[PDB]
Amino acid sequence: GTGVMGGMVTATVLAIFFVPVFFVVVRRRFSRK
Amino acid sequence: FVPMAFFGGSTGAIYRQFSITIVSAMALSVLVALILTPALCATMLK
Amino acid sequence: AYLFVRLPSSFLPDEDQGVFMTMVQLPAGATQERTQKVLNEVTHYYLTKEKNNVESVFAVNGFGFAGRGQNTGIAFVSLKDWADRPGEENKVEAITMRATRAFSQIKDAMVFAFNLPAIVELGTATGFDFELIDQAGLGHEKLTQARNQLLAEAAKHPDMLTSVRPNGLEDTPQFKIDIDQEKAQALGVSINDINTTLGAAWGGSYVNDFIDRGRVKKVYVMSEAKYRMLPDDIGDWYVRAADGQMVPFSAFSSSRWEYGSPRLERYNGLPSMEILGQAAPGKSTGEAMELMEQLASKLPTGVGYDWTGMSYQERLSGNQAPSLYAISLIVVFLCLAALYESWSIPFSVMLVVPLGVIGALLAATFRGLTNDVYFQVGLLTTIGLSAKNAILIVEFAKDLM
Amino acid sequence: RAFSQIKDAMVFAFNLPAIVELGTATGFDFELIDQAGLGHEKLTQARNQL
Amino acid sequence: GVGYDWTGMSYQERLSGNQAPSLYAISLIVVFLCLAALYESWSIPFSVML
Amino acid sequence: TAAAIRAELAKMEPFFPSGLKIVYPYDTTPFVKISIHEVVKTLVEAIILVFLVMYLFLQNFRATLIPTIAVPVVLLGTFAVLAAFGFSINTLTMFGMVLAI
Amino acid sequence: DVITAIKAQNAQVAAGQLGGTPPVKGQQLNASIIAQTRLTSTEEFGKILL
Amino acid sequence: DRPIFAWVIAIIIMLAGGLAILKLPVAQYPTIAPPAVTISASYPGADAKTVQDTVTQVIEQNMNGIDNLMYMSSNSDSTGTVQITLTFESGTDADIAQVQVQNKLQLAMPLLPQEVQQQGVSVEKSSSSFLMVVGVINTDGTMTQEDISDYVAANMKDAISRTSGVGDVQLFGSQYAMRIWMNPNELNKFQLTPV
Amino acid sequence: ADAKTVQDTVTQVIEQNMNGIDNLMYMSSNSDSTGTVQITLTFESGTDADIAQVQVQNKLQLAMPLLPQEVQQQGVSVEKSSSSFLMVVGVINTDGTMTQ
Numbered sequence A: 001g002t003g004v005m006g007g008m009v010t011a012t013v014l015a016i017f018f019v020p021v022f023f024v025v026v027r028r029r030f031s032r033k
Numbered sequence B: 001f002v003p004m005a006f007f008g009g010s011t012g013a014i015y016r017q018f019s020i021t022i023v024s025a026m027a028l029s030v031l032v033a034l035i036l037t038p039a040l041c042a043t044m045l046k
Numbered sequence C: 001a002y003l004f005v006r007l008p009s010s011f012l013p014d015e016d017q018g019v020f021m022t023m024v025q026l027p028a029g030a031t032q033e034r035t036q037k038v039l040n041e042v043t044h045y046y047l048t049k050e051k052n053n054v055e056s057v058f059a060v061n062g063f064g065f066a067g068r069g070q071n072t073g074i075a076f077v078s079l080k081d082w083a084d085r086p087g088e089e090n091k092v093e094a095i096t097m098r099a100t101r102a103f104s105q106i107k108d109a110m111v112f113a114f115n116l117p118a119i120v121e122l123g124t125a126t127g128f129d130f131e132l133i134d135q136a137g138l139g140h141e142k143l144t145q146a147r148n149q150l151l152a153e154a155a156k157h158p159d160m161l162t163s164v165r166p167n168g169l170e171d172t173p174q175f176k177i178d179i180d181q182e183k184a185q186a187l188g189v190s191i192n193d194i195n196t197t198l199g200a201a202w203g204g205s206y207v208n209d210f211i212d213r214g215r216v217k218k219v220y221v222m223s224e225a226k227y228r229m230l231p232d233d234i235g236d237w238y239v240r241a242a243d244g245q246m247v248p249f250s251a252f253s254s255s256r257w258e259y260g261s262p263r264l265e266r267y268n269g270l271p272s273m274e275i276l277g278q279a280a281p282g283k284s285t286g287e288a289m290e291l292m293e294q295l296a297s298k299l300p301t302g303v304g305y306d307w308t309g310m311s312y313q314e315r316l317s318g319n320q321a322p323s324l325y326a327i328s329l330i331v332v333f334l335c336l337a338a339l340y341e342s343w344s345i346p347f348s349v350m351l352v353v354p355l356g357v358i359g360a361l362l363a364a365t366f367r368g369l370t371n372d373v374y375f376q377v378g379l380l381t382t383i384g385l386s387a388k389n390a391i392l393i394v395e396f397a398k399d400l401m
Numbered sequence D: 001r002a003f004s005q006i007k008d009a010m011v012f013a014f015n016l017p018a019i020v021e022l023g024t025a026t027g028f029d030f031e032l033i034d035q036a037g038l039g040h041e042k043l044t045q046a047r048n049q050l
Numbered sequence E: 001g002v003g004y005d006w007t008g009m010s011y012q013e014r015l016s017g018n019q020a021p022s023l024y025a026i027s028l029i030v031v032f033l034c035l036a037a038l039y040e041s042w043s044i045p046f047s048v049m050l
Numbered sequence F: 001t002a003a004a005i006r007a008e009l010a011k012m013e014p015f016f017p018s019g020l021k022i023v024y025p026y027d028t029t030p031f032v033k034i035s036i037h038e039v040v041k042t043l044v045e046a047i048i049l050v051f052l053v054m055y056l057f058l059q060n061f062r063a064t065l066i067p068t069i070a071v072p073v074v075l076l077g078t079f080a081v082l083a084a085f086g087f088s089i090n091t092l093t094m095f096g097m098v099l100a101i
Numbered sequence G: 001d002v003i004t005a006i007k008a009q010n011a012q013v014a015a016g017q018l019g020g021t022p023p024v025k026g027q028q029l030n031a032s033i034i035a036q037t038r039l040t041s042t043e044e045f046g047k048i049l050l
Numbered sequence H: 001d002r003p004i005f006a007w008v009i010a011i012i013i014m015l016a017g018g019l020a021i022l023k024l025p026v027a028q029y030p031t032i033a034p035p036a037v038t039i040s041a042s043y044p045g046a047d048a049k050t051v052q053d054t055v056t057q058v059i060e061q062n063m064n065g066i067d068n069l070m071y072m073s074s075n076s077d078s079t080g081t082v083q084i085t086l087t088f089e090s091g092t093d094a095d096i097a098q099v100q101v102q103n104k105l106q107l108a109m110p111l112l113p114q115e116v117q118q119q120g121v122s123v124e125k126s127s128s129s130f131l132m133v134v135g136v137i138n139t140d141g142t143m144t145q146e147d148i149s150d151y152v153a154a155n156m157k158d159a160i161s162r163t164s165g166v167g168d169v170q171l172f173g174s175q176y177a178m179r180i181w182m183n184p185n186e187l188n189k190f191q192l193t194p195v
Numbered sequence I: 001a002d003a004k005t006v007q008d009t010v011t012q013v014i015e016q017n018m019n020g021i022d023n024l025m026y027m028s029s030n031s032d033s034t035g036t037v038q039i040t041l042t043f044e045s046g047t048d049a050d051i052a053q054v055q056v057q058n059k060l061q062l063a064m065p066l067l068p069q070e071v072q073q074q075g076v077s078v079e080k081s082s083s084s085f086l087m088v089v090g091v092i093n094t095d096g097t098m099t100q
Helices: A002-016 B026-043 C032-048 C092-105 C140-154 C181-187 C191-200 C231-236 C286-295 C353-365 C373-384 C387-400 D040-049 F002-010 F034-055 F066-080 G002-009 G042-046 H003-023 H048-060 H096-105 H145-151 H153-157 H184-189 I003-015 I051-060
Strands: C019-025 C054-061 C072-079 C131-134 C173-179 C205-211 C216-221 C238-240 C246-248 C253-259 C272-278 C303-306 D031-034 E002-005 F020-027 G031-034 H036-042 H071-074 H081-087 H122-125 H132-138 H178-180 I026-028 I040-042
Touching: A002 C353, A002 C373, A002 C387, B026 F066, B026 H003, C019 C032, C019 C092, C032 C054, C032 C072, C032 C092, C054 F020, C072 F020, C131 C140, C140 C272, C140 C286, C173 C191, C181 C191, C191 C205, C191 C238, C191 G002, C205 I003, C216 I003, C231 C253, C238 H184, C272 C286, C353 C373, C373 C387, D031 D040, F002 H132, F034 F066, F066 H003, G031 H048, H036 H048, H036 H096, H048 H071, H048 H081, H096 H122, H096 I051, H132 H145, H145 H153
Parallel strands: C173 G031, C216 H178
Antiparallel strands: C019 C072, C054 C072, C131 C272, C131 C303, C173 C253, C205 C216, C238 C246, D031 E002, F020 H132, H036 H081, H036 H122, H071 H081, I026 I040
């Protein structure tokens, strides 16, 4: 239980707007080619 | 999941205690939420 | 990456089972009377000062794990339901802790009491079961000292700790009756008559079978205890000579006290002694074995080592995890191109994985939990579940383009 | 009939059940067991009474 | 001290009984069901079932 | 095994003489019968707790039914595919169901 | 006579133990009894009396 | 896509999954154990050093050509009991790993002294941990350790160990035997040896 | 040997030694006046008749030396059964007539 939910809130809050996400289609597709 | 069912021997198939069931429910879901759900969304809603 | 290596291992969490067992071990050649004294003190504890916890005690004398003996004893402890013991002090984890303490606080013998490992056996987590083998065909006396040296040189490494002690061991004084073979044939007694007299009257003989109320049962002849408790009782026995008159034992037999093993061991058809040890409060398994492997290499000649328990063989999280996620990475990156195509989206989801891992490590570290199988699979479920959010918004993104 | 009509012993003669055995149809094969370890003489009379 | 058991005979666990009520019953929840494939409603499932 | 260890022990109790009573100083049975009663308890709670977060976000029973009718079907069908081919039919798998609930 | 002398002198016999298994209440020591052991070398076999 | 067909597919998945629940009673584990086949022999009244050289070594020497195996551990105790646990690879047929071990013993059987032969010798599958313990106590015309242990064996024990897949039952006592307790002085009086 | 002795000296020794056989429904015994005894260990319909053969035989290998030397040399055998004959082939003489 504790393993998923703890890793879920960060896979919710940091995955909703923060680092990889959106930089996924922008920073990780273009900026180059 | 599935590429964890190449495990060891004495830690038996403890990681195959499910690379599959979570898939046997996942691939089952991807089939049920494709055959059933779509049609149940058509019957009752709004 | 820091909160991952700092986090300890663990295999499968040590579970409360509602039932645990204690273990009693007496010293060199103790009697059933002396073992019962300790077992009565153990059965006392769970019934006197542990009422609102323990359901029943099944104290068995003579029966100990690792093998039988008039020197051992275990007691099966049942506990009262689950809801009837609310607190953390009320369940096995802490009951055993006071049980271990109370017995170790005051005792003339050795009593432990442990919890069920939630399986049959095979490996704790950071524990070992070293096996030292006689290779060149040395004596058992030479093996014991090489076993002694290994433990002594091992106990000389508490800095980078280990915890090593052997099994059974004892090596108790035995009484050896030495029959003067030439004096026996001279005075008129048969060698087969003497060995039966010594065997049947002290150890007991299986004669035949008899019927007891419609049941085939055995017939044993062993002689009264009155005449076999002491070494002086040997002289009380008589053997009939050919000329039809009795001859005592002392007239043809020598009596000597001599050291011997009560439990010899053999690994793969070669005389071996089992060493059982621990990793360390710092180190774990990998170095604990590595140390033990050349702490044995610096022993006398004709002395080898093997692993059994424990030391897998071929298992653990190590040699499994680097083959786990790696082949779960060359198929994630690959199948993340079906209706996605280029080397584009394979980086638009592949890298949302640390978003899941961070909080799982945050939870495990800031709770007291550890990287076990349940955390492993939990760390696996979160990642594809984290994907079905990223691979879905990127789907919507590449669909929008 | 012919054997049972005139005989000093016991003769039957039957037909093959078209299998190995296990059950006729409406037939039984009761088994009475000695449980408390009574004598064989006591078992026979309990078998007689049944 | 006198007990009983069955061997022959008295199955064990067989016959038409305990087989027939599990035969047609699960051959009824799948007849009625598959009698809706390209038939649909609770209509035709009574136009053949009976 | 334990279901029939009782069954073998069951039909020898009536022939017992004065004072013979059966006690259970060691039994693993109830623990196994709990690793299901606690799983189903968590399983059912996961159905109702979903049912509620359906009323919030997308109000009305007539919509909450669908994402809650789809849940036991997959769960049930996962019991079935534990027989399939040449694999499985077990517990903790019954518990890994909750990690996939 | 050679053969007979071997199995009579070169053999391991199973004698009992001091303070056996049904003991006298108050028995302190429980030790095993060793009698004839198996011969080990060419010298010991040479010293077999005929 | 029509609804009535799809709502019937779920009914099949309902029933097929429902029929799989009838594997109840479904046990906890998922087997982990690398299969254990144990050989046991007992020389009555014999010491630890003799039972090693006369039984233990004879058994081990005769363990060659067993299909699969990880290792073999041995004990040879002071009581005269010896156990050889031939441990196999995780997933080997525990039924075939049973009989081949037993048939290697059938070549070492007549080399074992007549005292140990009549005293049983057995090969069975192992778990090293108890599943269930069922105690039998008296609360009326109180019997005895000797009395209860005999009855528990000559009325119940035999029915188990042969029932639903039991490895081996360890009875907490012993069944009755005709115990003859000799007297050395009374033997010496009438010129008699235990023989 | 008589019926009462072959029960107590052979039959009971075999049955007592039948523990830990994988699967089984029941065991029936006979012990006849002629000195013949048959123990039919019946198994569940579909169990490997080849493996149910050897494990029964290996339980007998623990009761074998407890049987009197008279019965040991007189065979002892474990085989699969059908309780009914498939085929009987009689051999008669019609020339220089032999004998039973």
